Design a protein around this motif. Structure first.
Motif, PDB file in Angstrom:
ATOM      1  N   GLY A 177     -16.089  49.570  70.883  1.00 19.70           N
ATOM      2  CA  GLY A 177     -17.194  50.369  70.398  1.00 19.70           C
ATOM      3  C   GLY A 177     -17.455  50.264  68.917  1.00 19.70           C
ATOM      4  O   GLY A 177     -18.237  51.055  68.382  1.00 19.70           O
ATOM      5  N   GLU A 201     -11.685  50.499  57.388  1.00 19.79           N
ATOM      6  CA  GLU A 201     -11.316  50.427  58.795  1.00 19.79           C
ATOM      7  C   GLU A 201     -12.275  49.572  59.613  1.00 19.79           C
ATOM      8  O   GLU A 201     -12.066  49.409  60.818  1.00 19.79           O
ATOM      9  N   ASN A 202     -13.312  49.013  58.994  1.00 18.91           N
ATOM     10  CA  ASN A 202     -14.287  48.211  59.715  1.00 18.91           C
ATOM     11  C   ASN A 202     -14.015  46.733  59.488  1.00 18.91           C
ATOM     12  O   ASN A 202     -14.226  46.241  58.370  1.00 18.91           O
ATOM     13  N   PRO A 203     -13.558  45.987  60.498  1.00 23.58           N
ATOM     14  CA  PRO A 203     -13.390  44.488  60.338  1.00 23.58           C
ATOM     15  C   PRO A 203     -14.675  43.715  60.080  1.00 23.58           C
ATOM     16  O   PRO A 203     -14.614  42.482  59.964  1.00 23.58           O
ATOM     17  N   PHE A 204     -15.821  44.385  59.989  1.00 19.00           N
ATOM     18  CA  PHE A 204     -17.114  43.741  59.766  1.00 19.00           C
ATOM     19  C   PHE A 204     -17.613  43.936  58.339  1.00 19.00           C
ATOM     20  O   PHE A 204     -18.816  44.104  58.114  1.00 19.00           O
ATOM     21  N   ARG A 205     -16.711  43.934  57.362  1.00 20.59           N
ATOM     22  CA  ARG A 205     -17.083  44.125  55.963  1.00 20.59           C
ATOM     23  C   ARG A 205     -18.028  43.038  55.474  1.00 20.59           C
ATOM     24  O   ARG A 205     -17.589  41.987  55.012  1.00 20.59           O
ATOM     25  N   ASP A 245     -16.279  57.372  68.387  1.00 23.61           N
ATOM     26  CA  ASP A 245     -17.381  56.447  68.598  1.00 23.61           C
ATOM     27  C   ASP A 245     -17.778  55.862  67.250  1.00 23.61           C
ATOM     28  O   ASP A 245     -18.478  56.529  66.474  1.00 23.61           O
ATOM     29  N   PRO A 246     -17.362  54.638  66.920  1.00 28.53           N
ATOM     30  CA  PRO A 246     -17.754  54.052  65.630  1.00 28.53           C
ATOM     31  C   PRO A 246     -19.252  53.882  65.454  1.00 28.53           C
ATOM     32  O   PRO A 246     -19.722  53.844  64.311  1.00 28.53           O
ATOM     33  N   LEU A 247     -20.019  53.775  66.539  1.00 30.95           N
ATOM     34  CA  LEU A 247     -21.469  53.668  66.404  1.00 30.95           C
ATOM     35  C   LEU A 247     -22.072  54.970  65.888  1.00 30.95           C
ATOM     36  O   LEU A 247     -22.878  54.963  64.951  1.00 30.95           O
ATOM     37  N   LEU A 248     -21.695  56.100  66.494  1.00 39.43           N
ATOM     38  CA  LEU A 248     -22.234  57.387  66.063  1.00 39.43           C
ATOM     39  C   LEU A 248     -21.726  57.765  64.678  1.00 39.43           C
ATOM     40  O   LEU A 248     -22.492  58.251  63.839  1.00 39.43           O
ATOM     41  N   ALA A 278     -17.208  61.509  71.416  1.00 38.58           N
ATOM     42  CA  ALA A 278     -18.092  61.124  70.319  1.00 38.58           C
ATOM     43  C   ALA A 278     -17.339  60.968  69.004  1.00 38.58           C
ATOM     44  O   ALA A 278     -17.803  60.248  68.112  1.00 38.58           O
ATOM     45  N   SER A 311     -18.820  56.194  73.730  1.00 34.08           N
ATOM     46  CA  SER A 311     -18.955  57.587  74.125  1.00 34.08           C
ATOM     47  C   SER A 311     -20.237  57.870  74.890  1.00 34.08           C
ATOM     48  O   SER A 311     -20.372  58.962  75.453  1.00 34.08           O
ATOM     49  N   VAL A 336     -17.390  54.196  60.680  1.00 29.95           N
ATOM     50  CA  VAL A 336     -16.112  54.359  59.993  1.00 29.95           C
ATOM     51  C   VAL A 336     -16.233  53.711  58.619  1.00 29.95           C
ATOM     52  O   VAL A 336     -16.998  52.748  58.461  1.00 29.95           O
ATOM     53  N   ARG A 353     -23.638  39.852  60.141  1.00 30.92           N
ATOM     54  CA  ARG A 353     -23.475  38.407  60.204  1.00 30.92           C
ATOM     55  C   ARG A 353     -24.379  37.855  61.291  1.00 30.92           C
ATOM     56  O   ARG A 353     -24.626  38.524  62.295  1.00 30.92           O
TER      57      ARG A 353
END
Ligand SMILES: CC(C)CCC[C@@H](C)[C@H]1CC[C@H]2[C@@H]3CC=C4C[C@@H](O)CC[C@]4(C)[C@H]3CC[C@]12C
Ligand SMILES: Cc1cc(C(F)(F)F)nc(Nc2ccccc2-c2nnn[nH]2)n1
Lengths: 232, 217, 338, 270, 56
Positions: free
Chosen positions: C322, E52-56, E42-45, E39, C279, E48, C47
């Motif tokens: 994160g 589970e991601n509120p950014f759909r 860590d959602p970045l690495l 790690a 992390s 998810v 977004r």
């Protein structure tokens, strides 16, 4: 911050009484507004909504098209030009201080009000608590179930709680069913399971006396519960 | 969406509308930045054009609002906040024509003018050359020669020729001459037409920017 | 005598260099060579936050990792709801020039700062309803490059007066001035325990200060360019500092020396922001190349070429949970990545 | 005979030049659209104009192909009605898109303190789109009146067709002329304003003058002069298509990034 | 004159220098342990799944 108003008095049915609510103390033009009636011996039901400058106007089924509410942002005044009064329209109108952002506190301030009297698929919500004798120094969890699940895609549960003291105006206690409004003591907290919505209050004092209204904000024909009275 | 989401989205669009009207007002409200060295006639020019941190001056002239910004305060490296002046649509440099021999303040004046005009951020902002204290320079030019200021000077000790040479040197500090243009207005520190010069130059800059945004220029 | 004191300072510099070298038995690359690399990271634009009429200079998150405060030269401080793109606020500044914005962990307060030399602090939850300044701190003789709330009343301001300052908002004065940065401080990072904060100044040296005691604890001079953004490791015993030389140098507190440098021949645009993850496996940076190149913290390699912004990514941040990454840029848009 | 021959020659050279110009605009905008280069609203309007005029030029080439491939089909009058309808629609869109470009230029460039111009200046893209959308009533009236004329012809008749669409295209041309003329004054009054203090267009004015004189000549000739009825179709087609043929050329000459793209491709050809 | 800030710098440098310095090997090992033990969350690495991601 003040929300003084105008209008009122004995107005013949079918006429046109205009209520002007002028606010001195905050930004009228960048902060939305509402109109919630309250009969002399009844509860409160939302009448009309005005954006912060009349962007979109919404009405109840009983005032749809009948009313015409606007405002003057340079004049710091909100105008309720109401036409064709009736028997069920005599109610104490609050030009509600309503703001709309994430984690906002709409309906934070309700003005002193101006009683207007007339000569002779919604999300219904339940307040089956009715009357409860609240004792000081006791934790109170008060419930208000919703006809439609108040959750959403963003996950915010749009349920509100308001404190109506005798002679005063409602103030927001719990907004979005969990958060705490500014100026409310930390003894209030909000939690719910999706339908059954518990308002947790611990160690109540005399400042909490009054009635508690549960308000949703899912479909804009908003509903208020009957209002459970909290008296010692 | 939800009624809260709908109302918050409406408040978002209408905050956007308020910002749109603010930008409409800023279409005629032109941002000027004043660039002057220590005692370079900047006080005189701000006084004439009127008729630490920063000094903000808001006004208007024939339905053209101006917001002048003075940055004499906040002495620092100037390499870490100058990018805040990307949105300024006018630059007025200030100095004195007689400042070529005391200590040389002309060297530092030309130095920060070069750092401003030939900046990797100010390649698209134009220049107004407000000069002040012209009477002292006019009296003093015949007294002492300008060759001490510039070793490559062969002209006479005349105010017209000395001013022209100083303006040629001052203009040579700019290398990107296409996007921006330098206006000049020799003031004898007593003129009341400085605000009119600002009006005409700023209107010219608006015209040029609009032509560029239309792809014509 | 200035000569003998200068000689003593040089001898102490030699001593610290000798101690650092004597504690440098092996590097972090040696330890991390025998582990599986991160590989390639792919995050798209989920977004874009439109509405700023001018370029966004500072961006900050909140404790809930949902709300987002952005500062622009248009004189407006706009708060956004990330999940449902919506402009929460539009704060008209007294001075249109703002470079730093800090969202307090409590979420009740925001800060700006710029050429006005003043930390304008706003009680967003105003009883009136609008947003007004709660205090205008005036003790800094320079621009406010970075501010970070410690509590609702304590704010550490990195200013252009070559010093950081810890402020008492209600009192209005500076309860403690952090002196020692020969250059004006551009960014400061807080430890999670909020006991020691670092300050990356323009002297190509980040200094680890003790907030309560009041003096610097360790100094780290490895950069060839000024530090524009600094971020502690999630553990807090190390940090990565970004410079204008397009190199990020990770420093470990306990060894008080350089650990790794994240540079490549393709990347010459200076780093404008530095971000870790929850992390610390991944080192994000925004440059003047209008791109967000992101690095692997453990092994020196570029593990991403995230680019969705037309102009320079001035402010880059990662949420407390994160989950996502915010990339405020000068194209007047903030974009989230996943 | 010879008139038909050289008029077909000029029709085909207009076809090739208009195809090149409109393809030029479309390509140099689309490549930047897909490459990622920043593109301005002016060039979006120029892309819309390029596609409209390429459709127009294709339609006129199709009309001439009908005139050549099957003269019997040219005498059917059913294709005549069908083609006249689509031609009116597309050419109205093209001419009013050019006038919207002119509105954009005049709104942005001039300096008028009136509240109408200042309001129009802020919404300059929106004003152009609104003009392109509001000329739809003029398009509908033109369609209805030309259909009435064609029905009367079915029931010298072609002279009313050429006369009618002659006027219906001059009216957006003259409103463009009004805005363009004010641009000369507004620049002149600004030049005079700077004259008191310290001290491409030729292409557009020349093209306007040439278009006006040729249109007036053909209009008055068909109104009064004879001997043009038997070649009215071919002359009418070439004249009614010459506007996208050369306006695109003067437009790419006027615009700066289109001109830079032309220089770049010329260097590529070397 | 210069004695004030010269002595201040000397004292600050002495206080910084007297601090114990752990070998870089232990620091790198601690960094690796913290990276590995964290790690997984860590959602970045590990992006998810979008449920589970509120950014759909
Ligand atoms: C003079 C300027 C201002 C306006 C030009 C438009 C008018 C005059 C011209 C240009 C294009 C022309 C049309 C183009 C093609 C044909 C098909 C042919 O089978 C019959 C005539 C017909 C239908 C023409 C009628 C007249 C026409 C509409
Ligand atoms: C090449 C060029 C230069 C200029 C300039 F003078 F502003 F610089 N203006 C135009 N265009 C117009 C401007 C106003 C009104 C109508 C047109 C128009 N209509 N059709 N073509 N141009 N064109």
């Amino acid at each position: 911050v003040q929300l003084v108003e105008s209008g009122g008095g004995l107005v013949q049915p079918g006429g046109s009484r205009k209520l002007s609510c002028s606010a001195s103390g905050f930004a009228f033009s960048s902060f939305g507004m509402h109109w919630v009636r309250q009969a002399p011996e009844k509860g409160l039901e939302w009448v009309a909504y005005i954006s912060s400058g009349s962007g979109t106007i919404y009405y109840a089924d009983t005032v749809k098209g009948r009313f015409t509410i606007s405002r003057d942002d340079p004049k710091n005044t909100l105008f309720l030009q109401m036409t064709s009064l009736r028997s069920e329209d005599t109610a104490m109108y609050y030009c509600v201080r309503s703001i709309y952002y994430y984690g906002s506190s709409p309906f934070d301030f309700w003005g002193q009000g101006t009683t207007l009297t007339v000569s002779s698929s919604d999300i219904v919500m339940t307040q089956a608590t009715s009357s409860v004798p609240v004792t000081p120094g006791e934790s109170v969890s008060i419930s208000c179930r919703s006809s439609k699940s108040l959750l959403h895609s963003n996950g915010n549960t749009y349920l509100y709680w308001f404190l109506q003291r005798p002679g005063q105006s409602p103030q927001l206690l719990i907004y979005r069913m969990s958060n705490l409004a500014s100026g409310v003591p930390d003894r209030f907290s909000g939690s719910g399971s999706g339908t059954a919505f518990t308002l947790t209050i611990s160690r109540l004092e005399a400042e909490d006396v009054g009635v508690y209204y549960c308000m949703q904000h899912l479909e804009y024909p908003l509903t208020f519960g009957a209002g459970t009275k909290l008296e010692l | 969406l939800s009624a809260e989401d709908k109302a918050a989205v409406e408040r978002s669009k209408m905050i956007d509308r308020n910002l749109q009207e603010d930008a409409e007002r800023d279409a005629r409200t032109v941002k000027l930045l004043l660039l002057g060295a220590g005692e370079s006639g900047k006080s005189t020019i701000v006084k004439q054009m009127k008729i630490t941190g920063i000094i903000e001056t808001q006004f208007s002239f024939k339905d053209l609002h101006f917001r002048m910004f003075d940055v004499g305060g906040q002495r620092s490296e100037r390499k870490k906040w100058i990018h805040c002046f990307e949105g300024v649509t006018c630059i007025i440099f200030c100095a004195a024509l007689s400042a070529y021999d005391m200590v040389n303040r002309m060297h530092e004046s030309l130095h920060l003018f070069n750092s401003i005009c030939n900046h990797k951020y100010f390649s698209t902002t134009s220049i107004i050359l407000f000069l002040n204290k012209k009477d002292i320079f006019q009296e003093k030019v015949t007294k002492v020669h300008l060759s001490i200021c510039f070793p490559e000077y062969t002209g006479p000790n005349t105010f017209e020729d000395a001013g022209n040479y100083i303006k040629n040197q001052f203009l040579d500090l700019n290398l990107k001459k296409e996007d921006k243009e330098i206006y000049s207005h020799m003031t004898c520190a007593t003129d009341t037409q400085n605000v009119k010069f600002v009006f005409d130059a700023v209107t010219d800059i608006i015209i040029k920017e609009n032509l560029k945004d239309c792809g014509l220029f | 005598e200035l000569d003998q004191l200068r000689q003593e300072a040089e001898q102490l510099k030699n001593q610290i260099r000798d101690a650092r070298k004597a504690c440098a038995d092996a590097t972090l690359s040696q330890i991390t060579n025998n582990i599986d690399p991160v590989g390639r990271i792919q995050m798209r634009t989920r977004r874009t936050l439109r509405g700023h009429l001018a370029k966004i200079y500072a961006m900050h998150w909140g404790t809930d990792s949902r709300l987002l405060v952005s500062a622009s030269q248009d004189g407006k401080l706009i708060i956004w709801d990330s999940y449902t793109t919506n402009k929460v606020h539009a704060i008209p500044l007294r001075s249109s020039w703002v470079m730093t914005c800090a969202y307090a962990p409590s979420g009740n307060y925001v800060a700006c700062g710029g050429l006005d030399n003043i930390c304008s602090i706003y009680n967003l939850k105003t009883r009136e309803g609008n947003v007004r300044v709660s205090r205008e701190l005036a003790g800094h003789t320079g621009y406010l490059s970075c501010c970070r709330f410690l509590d609702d009343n304590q704010i550490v301001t990195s200013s252009g007066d070559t010093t950081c300052a810890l402020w008492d908002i209600e009192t209005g004065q500076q309860t403690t001035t952090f002196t020692g940065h020969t250059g004006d401080v551009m960014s400061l990072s807080l430890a999670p325990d909020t006991r020691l904060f670092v300050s990356g100044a323009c002297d190509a040296s980040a200094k680890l200060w003790d907030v309560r005691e009041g003096m610097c604890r360790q100094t780290f001079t490895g950069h060839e360019s000024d530090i524009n953004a600094i971020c502690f490791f999630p553990n807090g015993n190390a940090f990565a500092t970004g410079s204008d030389d397009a190199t990020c140098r990770l420093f470990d507190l306990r060894a008080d020396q350089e650990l790794m440098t994240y540079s490549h021949d393709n990347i010459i645009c200076g780093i404008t922001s530095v971000s870790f993850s929850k992390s610390g496996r991944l080192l994000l940076a925004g440059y003047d190349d209008f791109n967000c190149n992101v690095w692997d913290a453990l092994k020196a390699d570029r593990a991403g070429v995230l680019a969705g912004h037309d102009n320079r990514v001035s402010c880059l941040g990662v949420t407390d949970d994160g989950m996502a990454v915010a990339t405020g840029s000068w194209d007047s848009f903030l974009k989230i990545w996943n | 005979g010879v008139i038909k021959s050289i008029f077909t020659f000029v029709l085909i050279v207009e076809f090739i030049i208009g195809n090149l110009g409109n393809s030029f605009i479309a390509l140099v905008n689309c490549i930047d659209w897909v490459k990622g280069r920043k593109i301005s609203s002016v060039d979006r309007i120029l892309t819309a104009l390029a596609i409209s005029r390429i459709s127009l030029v294709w339609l006129i080439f199709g009309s001439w192909c009908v005139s050549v491939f099957f003269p019997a089909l040219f005498a059917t009058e059913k294709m005549f009605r069908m083609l006249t309808n689509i031609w009116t629609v597309i050419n109205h869109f093209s001419v009013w898109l050019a006038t919207g470009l002119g509105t954009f230029y005049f709104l942005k460039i001039a300096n008028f303190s009136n509240s109408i111009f200042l309001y129009l200046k802020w919404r300059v893209k929106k004003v152009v789109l609104v003009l392109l959308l509001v000329t739809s009533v003029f398009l509908f009236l033109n369609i209805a009146l030309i259909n009435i004329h064609i029905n009367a012809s079915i029931n010298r008749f072609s002279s009313l067709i050429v006369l009618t669409s002659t006027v219906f295209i001059f009216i957006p041309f003259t409103l463009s002329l009004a805005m363009f003329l004010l641009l000369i004054f507004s620049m002149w009054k600004h030049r005079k304003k700077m004259q008191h203090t310290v001290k491409g267009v030729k292409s557009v004015i020349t093209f306007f003058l040439l278009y006006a004189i040729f249109s007036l000549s053909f209009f008055i000739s068909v109104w009064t002069s004879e001997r043009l009825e038997e070649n009215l179709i071919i002359l009418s087609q070439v004249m009614g298509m010459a506007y996208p043929s050369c306006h695109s050329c003067v437009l790419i000459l006027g615009n700066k990034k289109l001109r830079q793209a032309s220089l770049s491709v010329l260097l590529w050809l070397r | 004159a210069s004695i004030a800030q010269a002595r201040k710098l000397v004292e600050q440098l002495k206080m910084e220098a007297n601090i114990d310095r752990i070998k870089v090997s232990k620091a790198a090992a601690d960094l690796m342990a913290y990276c590995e033990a964290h790690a997984k969350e860590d959602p970045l690495l590990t992006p998810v799944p979008a449920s589970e991601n509120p950014f759909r």
